[PDB]
From a paper:
To gain insight into caspase activity and regulation in coral, we expressed and characterized two caspases each from two species of Caribbean reef-building corals, Orbicella faveolata and [name]. Two proteins referred to as PaCasp7a and OfCasp3a based on sequences similarity to human caspases contain CARD motifs at the N terminus, an unusual combination that has not been observed in caspases-3 or -7 enzymes from higher eukaryotes, and indeed these proteins function as initiator caspases. Our functional characterization suggests that PaCasp7a and OfCasp3a may function similarly to caspase-2 because they exhibit DXXDase activity and contain an N-terminal CARD motif.
The crystals diffracted in the P212121 space group, and we determined the structure to high resolution at 1.57 Å. In the active site, the carboxylate group of the P4 aspartate hydrogen bonds to Asn315 (CP-162) on active site loop 3 (L3), the backbone amide of Arg356 (GP9-02) on L4, and through water–hydrogen bonds to Trp321 (CP-168) (on L3) as well as the backbone carbonyl of Arg356 (GP9-02) (on L4). In general, the active site provides hydrophilic binding pockets for the P3 glutamate and P4 aspartate of the substrate, and a more hydrophobic binding pocket for the P2 valine side chain, similarly to that of HsCasp3. The structure of PaCasp7a also reveals a peptide bound on the protein surface near α-helices 1 and 4.
Numbering used by the authors: 384 to 387
């Protein structure tokens, strides 16, 4: 999970 990573933020855009």
């Amino acid at each position: 999970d990573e933020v855009d």
